[PDB]
């Protein structure tokens, strides 16, 4: 399971725990947790940008993953890996960042 | 944003 071994995936932690980790960190710092929803296989990307934590929803429909219509990524790691090298600006002009610094559960 | 960041569709 590529996702469970991903250093930046923290599974079932709270909004409050994530806020502790993201506190005072540089823009581009990010982790992924499970969505507060009941297991739609849904995850939440939290991203540091402009001094606050952006909550970005990772949708899971058919067998695909993504931030909006259409869902085209075959895994959440594939998705996150993509936006490590490409800004999220095309989804929302306020989000002119990449996923730069992973919050690592090994580190 | 209000809670979750609005992300635009590409379709």
* Resolution of the PDB structure in angstroms: 2.4
Given the DSSP bridges, would you call strands A29-34 and A101-102 parallel, antiparallel or unpaired?
Answer: parallel
Q: Are A22 and A32 in contact (CB under 8 A)?
A: no
- What length does chain B have? 11
**Chain A residues whose C-beta sits inside 8 Å of any chain B C-beta:** 54-57, 67-70, 88, 90-92, 94-95
Given the DSSP bridges, would you call strands A43-49 and A52-61 parallel, antiparallel or unpaired?
Answer: antiparallel
Please list every residue in chain B whose beta carbon sits closer than 8 Å to the beta carbon of residue A54.
Answer: 1, 5
Helix (H, G, I), strand (E, B) or coil at A45: strand
Q: Are B4 and A57 in contact (CB under 8 A)?
A: yes
Interface residue B2 vs chain A (CB under 8 A): no
Q: Tokens representing A101? A: 């610094």
**Domains of chain A, CATH where assigned:** 1-107 (3.30.505.10)
A12, exposed or middle or buried, with CB in 10 Å at 0-12, 13-18, 19+?
A: exposed
- b/e map A18-52, b = 16+ CB within 10 Å: beebbeeeebbbbbbbbbeeeeeebbbbbbbbeee
Q: What share of chain B is helix, strand, coil (3-state, %, to 5)?
A: 0, 10, 90
Q: Which of A55, A68, A92 lies nearest to residue B10, judging by beta carbons?
A: A68
Task: Give the residue from A88, A86, A81 showing the smallest Cα distance to A102.
Answer: A81
């Amino acid at each position: 399971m590529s996702l469970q071994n991903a250093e930046w995936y923290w599974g079932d932690i709270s909004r409050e725990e994530v806020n502790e980790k993201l506190r005072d960190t540089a823009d581009g710092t990010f982790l992924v947790r499970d969505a507060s929803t009941k297991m739609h296989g849904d995850y939440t990307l939290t991203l540091r940008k402009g001094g606050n934590n952006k909550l970005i929803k990772i949708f899971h429909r058919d067998g695909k993953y993504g931030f909006s219509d259409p869902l085209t990524f075959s895994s959440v790691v594939e998705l996150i890996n993509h936006y490590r090298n490409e800004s999220l600006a095309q989804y929302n002009p306020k989000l002119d960042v990449k996923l730069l610094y992973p919050v690592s559960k090994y580190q | 944003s209000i809670d979750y960041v609005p992300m635009l569709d590409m379709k």
